[PDB]
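Appendix B. One record, verbatim.
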Amino acid sequence: HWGYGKHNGPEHWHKDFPIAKGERQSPVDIDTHTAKYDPSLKPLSVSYDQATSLRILNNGHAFNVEFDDSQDKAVLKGGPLDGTYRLIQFHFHWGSLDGQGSEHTVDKKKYAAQLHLVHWNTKYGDFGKAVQQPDGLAVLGIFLKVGSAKPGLQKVVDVLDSIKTKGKSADFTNFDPRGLLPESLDYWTYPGSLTTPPLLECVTWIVLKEPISVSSEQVLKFRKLNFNGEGEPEELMVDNWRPAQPLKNRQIKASFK
């Protein structure tokens, strides 16, 4: 089964998911110098005032906070998108050291972690159909650097004990995703794919320029998680990130100068 180890690692995914060597794969290295500043890009409209978080679960690859997307509760609009995209879940990617952990890099610079708030195109009915389309999902990536502590993330840091091993899940109501957002909404955007199997090419990636800060001990609790299921040898969940992929026939536009 795919994973992040030398034997089932990101370098082996192609054998099961041929699309791993596709044309529009993610993540990629954002070269800030050759990124084409596009001025016709409307600004992001993020409305998480009505968001309903529900569960948090260790899926054996990462932990996910899930939201109720049976109605336009927390939606993403603006930017390069056409239509409403509704938040279905958010997850992280982190490293075993502070100098690695992000999937996307900026001018080859790796961050301590990276958050993906996943959204699907409502013109498509459900998430399962949305992943079948070139414009199905809109993922909002945010880099995390280690410095001061992000208060709004602590709630998540506390519950991690309850879901230490692959498979455990736990109620997680009343969580506000607005506490994870940085001050500025300037971004870079480009078309890409999911960074894990099935690695479908249905994403319009929106990577915020501005990272948020988290304390060491805050990110340190991300590293105590387990890839393994209960009653199995302990394999710590660290470095659950895919390396940067070739940009190819793509252009990264930017919403700022």
